[PDB]
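User: Last request for today: this protein with chloride ion, please.
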Amino acid sequence: MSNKLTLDKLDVKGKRVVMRVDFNVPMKNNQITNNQRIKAAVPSIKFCLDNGAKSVVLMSHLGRPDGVPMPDKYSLEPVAVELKSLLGKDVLFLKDCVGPEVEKACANPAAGSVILLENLRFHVEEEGKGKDASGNKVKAEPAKIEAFRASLSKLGDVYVNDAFGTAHRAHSSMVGVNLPQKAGGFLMKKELNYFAKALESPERPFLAILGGAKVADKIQLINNMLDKVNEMIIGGGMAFTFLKVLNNMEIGTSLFDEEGAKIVKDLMSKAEKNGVKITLPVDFVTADKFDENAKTGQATVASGIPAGWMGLDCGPESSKKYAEAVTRAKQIVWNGPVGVFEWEAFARGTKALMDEVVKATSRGCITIIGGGDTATCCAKWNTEDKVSHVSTGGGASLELLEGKVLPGVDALSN
Ligand SMILES: Nc1ncnc2c1ncn2[C@H]1O[C@@H](COP(=O)(O)OP(=O)(O)O)[C@H](O)[C@@H]1O
Ligand code: ALF
Ligand SMILES: [Cl-]
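Assistant: Here's the final one, the structure of the complex with chloride ion:
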């Protein structure tokens, strides 16, 4: 922000623009379920076209293909199709993001042309670490990583970064494009401004709700969050990693993070030290396979979860507790659903939680729900204008909350 180059200060007339966007949208059965993330990036894309930009080249990622190409699953071609509609302009989709063939198309396009490169996470050089065919985690070669970044840089004359949602990751698209002028997009600015107002001087008590399925990544955030919040609800897939360590509970086939489990005790003790109330689930709704149409089951912390069964939602007694926390708080940040909201058997808990968050905003409490899947709850239940702010980044928003500057923003020009 503030001392870094921005799109409004940028000159794009006659120049090709390579733009990093967060088009990592929710997919069901190969089709889009929400387009906010896409819709949010349009102002920046149009700006360039209206100001006489020769082309706009769009780079983004979908899901976690672990460095291997999966066009059948994690392809960006359907995206791509929505963009035309929001765009009102013909969009051209390429089956790779590199190089000589792709560089050919991007080398000097026809005026007003926008190009969607293929998914970046098909290459190990983005992250750059990944899984091979074995499922063996591997890392990309330093030299190759660096060739990857030189490839992107032929795609445009100026670089614009609008991907607030991935701004917290130091990947090759985010920090690697070497161009003389690297400018932050409007989404980046709109979002960064909003959070400078919200954090820096939070209304208290301040509560942080944690959920979702990305356990391994999101526990590492907690520790620095403990210094900035008053209360924490930790539900969703996170919950089981905590409960097995803390109470030697039995969690069945539920998500578990082993590395995360090594820090659970310390995290509790720092919460005590700082007096942050940690709220966890006391009962769950269970399933025998990972399916919409699985057989349902009931469980408690005391009861444990039966072998080969998994907890995909939180029980009614658990929702009762969360709701006590919500009522106390005057600012709330929520990332990650507490259950699998997409499937009707497991959307009970998440629905209840949102319902409470909406009342909270009525009494003047400030509510931020951020994240690609957690945002989709709002769209599904039409609570988008009922909450104080709905944000495009979830993990990214939490990383602002810790105090570290974002890799994406630190890499912008000064
Ligand atoms: N145990 C579980 N297993 C699978 N999905 C779960 C889950 N618990 C909750 N969910 C729900 O959490 C969602 C995880 O999405 P995430 O990317 O972490 O949230 P973000 O984009 O950061 O805001 C997933 O779609 C499912 O609806
Ligand atoms: F899927 Al996220 F924050 F991790 F939107
Ligand atoms: Cl993760």
